[PDB]
Amino acid sequence: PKELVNEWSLKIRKEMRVVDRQIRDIQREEEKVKRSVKDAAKKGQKDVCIVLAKEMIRSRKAVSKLYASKAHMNSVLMGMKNQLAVLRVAGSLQKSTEVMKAMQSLVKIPEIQATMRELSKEMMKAGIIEAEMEIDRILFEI
Template identity: 65%
Template sequence: VVDSLVLVAAADPLEKKKTLSMGLFSKSPSKTPKDQVNEWCSRIRKEGYGLDRQIRAIQREEEKVKRSLKEAAKKGDQDVCRVLAKEIVQSRKAISRIYTSKAHLNSVQSQMKAQLGVVGDHCWAAGHGTSHGT
């Protein structure tokens, strides 16, 4: 009976270590807040690059429409000119909305980094007893 208690007691710290290293709902170890923020910032940066690609594509299309508009104006076709001008206005509004979205992404990214700084300071202070090593 004593031998079995010793084995259970010896195995217990290992079990605690395994459960601490496991994530909340998965077997993978949980990431530190810094790692999570870095991963999220990377994803946000990639989304920003995607938005830049969309903006460039819209601008290329706008240049094509401008050329068509000039040709239609030379021919004196007012109906076509009106439609193409509306298309240019819509493309500029779309670009404006994309820039707004990109600004929101950058704002979220900077807020996450700021929160990481606050959380990091508190974690460091809790681990060392003082804030910023003083």
């Protein structure tokens, strides 16, 4: 039907489980690296420390960019929520500007981008990606 929404929610929600997992793993790694940095410091190995430290910055930045993604995705889920409404009201989808720039800053995250490119399209074709007709359009619940 017009339950594309419910499918896309599920996928988005799916991709968010992955992001959670990715972030849960990196953090578990930072746990260890932090201990390494401690030992290395105690044994006075300056250079092992400097390197590891860099490992951490890289870690933090990685996680950050992940949460960025989770947010962009959540932005899309919300838009999906809203779509149901724009329907429950009239019965069409509306080119949301919101679910368009989010679904733009997401096809750019490293790993996941193949699905996101594929969803962006399905979305573009249901006609929510890329009034005086609406004032007429809306008059369709008559």
